[PDB]
């Protein structure tokens, strides 16, 4: 009606376009976003290792469930005209080495970094999967260096299960917003290959509290 | 000893700047243009909606036959827009989807993006295949690439996180002039109508001004009290405008090296994301976070009118050659054509 | 980028025949496809159109109920399923590729052409079906239509095309004026929406073939009768 | 330190090459893009709107 | 009307 | 036998009823209907439940009317026709609508991966223009068999079905019984079944999703919890009065009651119904007025 014979395979051609970009969109709407934050010499590439020059993407599947973890170090550029590209991930993956403890200090770096992107007002109802990193090396540092280096005020042992509960909550104690964010914590090591079904755990709970919300139960 | 000697004469010459400046700021533009009458209120209405991006979008940039536009969002799009018809043109997946900024060549031949990949790719619309596939992928940079803006289908001038400017040669994929001088990340450019002159905006609070050829920066501008997000010459040249954190967007003129104007309102406080002039250069159009479209008189700083309609963040402005429409994109995923 | 038809041959009349047309080098998917064909004495007639997609599918009236013009994708080829030939079907048949969106250049690359040998329209007038020419010389080509074709939306669906005696046709110029990509710049096109002309500045042996007009602006496609230059 | 003074002696430089140029009042200045915004005022169809008749988006 | 409370009703069963 | 008389109270009382709920529901639907019409996922079946309930209590006063007068009924045919219909596929297009509500609820929330590509298949628009499809047709006997006219042992003008046109004595009883068990089966009893499944599941989830430990995560456990028992028997108090009469009111007819039982059953039967009109004045609060987002958004439009 009124278009050209050319006109209407135009709007043939844009249709299908919108065909393409629709179907595109399914699939992406569907696949895990996640952004993986972390200190300088933190175990992020022993985190990657497992679910295996800007942005550094990992793309990886578990249990049918599609993964992209989006590595954003080497972006040594200002957070605050970059980091909000990453506002609707479906959850923040940051990683914090244990054995830093004893190393401004480096652990109150990782809480400072930690604190900055955990009450950010881009991320207010993005969750946090919080690997706490060469839980071996600390059981064997904890033994030697006691964790009032970096926590003076810390009252406890010496030894694995209390200081590395403390320094999980000390972590803890940073969210701001407990009512509208949990924070999935977590002790790997070099050889701990259940890195992946902890995200996919922490992941999977994600998406079923955002849904709650999106429903209007909320 | 000589780091104390140097240091003291740059904060002397610092001091000469700032006496020649003042010296020449003998009236202000708004005492010259006090009684050049008032444009009045400007009522845009939406004449297109261009529906299709389903993430934020981040930028677009009108093609030079005021009909074609190129809009970037983080879908890994982007979207080769006939305006007039709301038809899609083409559509481009994207290597990396963290596209920040994106340009259309003046000859129509090629579109440009880039982002947090720092890597700003040319991609050629006109092939003999029939799709559209990147002719170059322009690595160098050490940031995000925050704009690009082409000079020529072989020229092309970029800015990114890494607080440089670079022009490439697109054909050998070299950077043939490296413009530095900022401290800050650069976050816009804009080039001058001659395109021997351009300007940048950074996340220092200054705008310099560089010769393309040269490689040097002529002027520094300072004025702002926080980043500059958004910059654009005024239509002649010879003047330019910055939008920057601080709710302000300011008028600053080459020639007498001196800020002119400011552009502010106290019932505005949110930052400003886009800026461009309209054909005459009467109007000032910027983008705010809080969702509208301000319509400034370049003239007086009165609000000349606002576009509305947006339900989220304006991220980009773009006016078309000719002056017939203003298109705003926005984090709604939506793109809208006003007059 | 080519297209290679193929199946032609000798049928008998009333019997059946598919065509095949190899497409490589571009984005098959892309395009929409014509089949396009040339009697043995006669210019060129439209047969059938498939868009890209399949969406939309045009035959000429000559051709309803008899011919199927078909699309493979993944294959990259394009078939037409004939049945009940006719002695008025004998034809090459060209495999013609077209590619629609605002500033494109559609039916800019044709095939070689198989041989299939059989044992309200908008009306394009050639009235000159032989120009002598010498080279160096410039020479102008004229086409009238029974129908305006200037658009309401300022384009006006004039195509030009160049037949070499060896050769299948080539596109000279889209939509009246525009230059199509690889055509040297001593052709040019203007018109009024009803009389067209075509003008080469200065001709050369290369140029020397059967100039065709077409109109675009409805369906069926139709073709001039086509003027030849003589050098 | 070298790299402290190396980054000075570019400052230096460069606020050498700022100071040294030649400028006019903003009087004049203001009154050139004041001049060019009547001048082209006609032409934009922003600030002057067009007919329904001559607008590409009607 | 053979229902007993056709009637006197919007709910015609 | 027994003699059958109206309740005297009951003509002021009922259409006095169809006022309070006619206007409680029109505002709580309208405001409802307006901000996701003019303005989340399954926002389709809000503004669905909304028309559904905004527009079956909407001919109340018609009723209210009618029954004020003695069971007078001075708007013709036409009404007689359209209001008995329109208030009929409501109740089906309500009891859907919720329905798809906890369908759609318990692929999002139970298995949000397993069942990503299917609700994307069969909810949404697909669930709404089936309910409103099914609904049309499954009222479909209504907007025909209702009529009007005057019987002389009355002397007044009053609605009713007299299937004249489709029964005879002989079958007659059966009509009325075989519309009042489908009717009831697929209103309510399959209804409600797949609303106590879905949100079984969807109960069953949040337990196990919400860790007690936490403070914040035992208040967000208890009230999703709590808001779930409440959507499931706010249903069931406000429809099965209504499902529970007409069902042994019909089966009177077969089985031997001792008369004033059935007399009960007529003088009750009317305020029953007119608990039906309460769940569509309930609805607005429960499915779009839970979400805080959602309220404050309303507020912000409403000034």
Redesign the interface.
């Known amino acids: 009606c009124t278009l050209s014979a050319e006109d209407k395979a135009a709007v043939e051609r844009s249709k299908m376009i919108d065909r393409n970009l629709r179907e595109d969109g399914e699939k992406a709407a569907r696949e895990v976003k996640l952004l993986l934050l972390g200190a300088g010499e933190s175990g992020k590439n022993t985190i990657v290792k497992q679910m295996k020059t800007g942005i550094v993407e990992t793309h990886f599947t578990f249990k049918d469930l599609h993964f992209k973890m989006f590595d954003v170090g080497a972006q040594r550029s200002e957070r605050k005209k970059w980091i909000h590209c990453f506002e609707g991930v479906t959850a923040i993956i940051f990683c914090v080495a244990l054995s830093d403890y004893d190393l401004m200090n480096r652990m109150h770096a990782s809480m400072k970094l930690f604190d900055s992107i955990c009450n950010n007002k881009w991320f207010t109802d993005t969750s946090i999967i919080l690997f706490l990193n060469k839980k071996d090396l600390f059981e064997e540092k904890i033994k030697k260096s006691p964790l009032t280096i970096c926590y003076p005020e810390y009252a406890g042992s010496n030894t694995y299960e209390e200081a590395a509960a403390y320094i999980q909550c000390q972590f803890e104690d940073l969210n701001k917003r407990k009512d509208t964010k949990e924070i999935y914590t977590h002790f790997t090591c070099s050889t701990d290959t259940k890195n992946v079904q902890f995200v996919f755990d922490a992941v999977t709970d994600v998406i079923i509290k955002n849904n709650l919300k999106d429903c209007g139960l909320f | 000893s000589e780091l104390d000697q140097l240091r003291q004469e740059a904060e002397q010459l610092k001091n000469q700047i700032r006496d020649a400046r003042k010296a020449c700021a003998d009236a202000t533009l708004s005492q010259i243009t006090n009684n050049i009458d008032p444009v009045g209120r400007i009522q845009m209405r939406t004449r297109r909606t261009l529906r299709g991006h389903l993430a934020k979008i981040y930028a677009m940039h009108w093609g030079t036959d005021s009909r074609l536009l190129v809009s970037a969002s983080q879908d890994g799009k982007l979207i080769i827009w006939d305006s007039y018809t709301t038809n899609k043109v083409h559509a481009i997946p994207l290597r990396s989807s963290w596209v920040m900024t994106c340009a259309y060549a003046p000859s129509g031949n090629y579109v440009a993006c880039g982002g947090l990949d720092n890597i700003c790719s040319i991609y050629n619309l006109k092939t003999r295949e029939g799709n559209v596939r990147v002719s170059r992928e322009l690595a160098g940079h050490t940031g995000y690439l925050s704009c690009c803006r082409f000079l020529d289908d072989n020229q092309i001038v970029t800015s990114s996180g890494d607080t440089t400017c670079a022009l490439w040669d697109i054909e050998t994929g070299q950077q043939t002039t490296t413009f530095t001088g900022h401290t800050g990340d650069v976050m816009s450019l804009s080039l001058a109508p001659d395109t021997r002159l351009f300007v940048s905006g950074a996340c220092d609070a200054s705008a310099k001004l560089w010769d393309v050829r040269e490689g040097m920066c002529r002027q520094t501008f300072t004025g702002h009290e926080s980043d500059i997000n958004a910059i654009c010459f005024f239509p002649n040249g010879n003047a330019f405008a910055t939008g920057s954190d601080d709710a302000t967007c300011r008028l600053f003129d080459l020639r007498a090296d001196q800020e002119l104007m400011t552009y502010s309102h106290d019932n505005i406080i949110c930052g400003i994301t886009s800026v461009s002039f309209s054909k005459s250069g009467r109007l000032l159009l910027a983008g705010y976070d809080d969702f509208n479209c301000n319509v400034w008189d370049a003239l007086k700083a009165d609000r000349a009118g606002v576009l509305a309609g947006h339900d989220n963040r304006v991220s980009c402005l773009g006016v078309t050659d000719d002056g017939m429409a203003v298109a705003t994109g926005s984090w709604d995923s939506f793109l809208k054509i006003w007059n | 980028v080519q297209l290679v038809e193929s199946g032609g041959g000798l049928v008998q009349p009333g019997g059946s025949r598919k065509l095949s047309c190899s497409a490589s080098g571009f984005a098959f998917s892309s395009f929409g496809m014509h089949w396009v064909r040339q009697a043995p004495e006669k210019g060129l007639e439209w047969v059938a159109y498939i868009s890209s997609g399949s969406g939309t599918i045009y035959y000429a009236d000559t051709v309803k109920g008899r011919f199927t013009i078909s699309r493979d994708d993944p294959k990259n080829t394009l078939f037409l399923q004939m049945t009940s030939l006719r002695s008025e079907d004998t034809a090459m048949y060209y495999c013609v590729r077209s590619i629609y969106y605002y500033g494109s250049s559609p039916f800019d690359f044709w095939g070689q052409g198989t041989t299939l040998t059989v044992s309200s329209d908008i009306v394009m007038t050639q009235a000159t079906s032989s120009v002598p020419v010498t080279p160096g010389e410039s020479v102008s080509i004229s086409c009238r239509s029974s129908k305006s074709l200037l658009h309401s939306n300022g384009n006006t669906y004039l195509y030009w095309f160049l037949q070499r005696p060896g050769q299948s046709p080539q596109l000279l110029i889209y939509r009246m004026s525009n230059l199509a990509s690889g055509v040297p710049d001593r052709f040019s096109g203007s018109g009024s929406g009803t009389a067209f002309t075509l003008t080469i500045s200065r001709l050369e042996a290369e140029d020397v073939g059967v100039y065709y007009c077409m109109q675009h602006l409805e369906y069926p496609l139709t073709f001039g009768a086509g003027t030849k230059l003589e050098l | 330190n070298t790299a402290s003074i190396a980054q000075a002696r570019k400052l230096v430089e460069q606020l050498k090459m700022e100071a040294n140029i030649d400028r006019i009042k903003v009087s004049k200045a203001a009154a050139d893009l004041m001049a060019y915004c009547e001048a082209h005022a006609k032409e934009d169809p922003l600030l002057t709107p067009v007919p329904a008749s001559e607008n590409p988006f009607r | 009307?053979?229902?007993?409370?056709?009637?006197?009703?919007?709910?015609?069963? | 036998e027994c003699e059958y008389t109206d309740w005297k109270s009951s003509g002021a009382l009922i259409p006095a009823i169809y006022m309070l709920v006619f206007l409680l529901g029109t505002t709580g639907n309208g405001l409802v209907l307006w901000t996701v019409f003019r303005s989340r996922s399954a926002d389709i079946f809000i503004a669905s439940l909304a028309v559904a309930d905004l527009t079956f209590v909407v001919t109340l006063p018609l009723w209210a009317t009618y029954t004020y007068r003695d069971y007078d009924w001075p708007f013709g045919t036409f009404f007689c026709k359209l209001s008995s219909y329109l208030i009929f596929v409501n109740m089906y297009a309500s009891v859907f609508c919720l329905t798809g509500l906890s369908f759609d609820r318990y692929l999002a929330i139970v298995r949000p991966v397993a069942n990503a590509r299917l609700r994307l298949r069969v909810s949404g628009a697909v669930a709404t223009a089936v309910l409103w499809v099914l609904a049309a047709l499954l009222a479909m006997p209504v907007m025909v068999l209702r009529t009007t006219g005057d019987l002389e042992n009355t002397t007044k003008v009053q609605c009713y079905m007299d299937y004249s046109m489709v029964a005879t004595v002989s079958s007659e009883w059966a009509w009325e019984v075989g519309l009042g068990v489908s009717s009831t089966t697929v209103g309510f009893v399959v209804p409600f079944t797949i609303m106590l499944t879905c949100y079984f599941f969807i109960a069953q989830t949040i337990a196990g999703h919400f860790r007690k430990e936490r403070i914040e995560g035992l208040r967000k456990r208890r009230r999703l919890l709590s808001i779930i028992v409440v959507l499931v028997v706010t249903f069931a108090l406000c429809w099965m009065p209504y499902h529970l009469v007409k069902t042994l009111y019909m089966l009177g007819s077969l089985l031997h009651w001792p008369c004033d039982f059935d007399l009960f059953l007529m003088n009750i039967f009317p305020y029953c119904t007119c608990i039906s009109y309460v769940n569509s004045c309930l609805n607005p609060f429960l499915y779009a007025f839970f979400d805080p987002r959602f309220r404050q958004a309303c507020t912000s439009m409403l000034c």
């Open positions: 009307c053979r229902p007993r409370l056709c009637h006197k009703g919007p709910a015609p069963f």
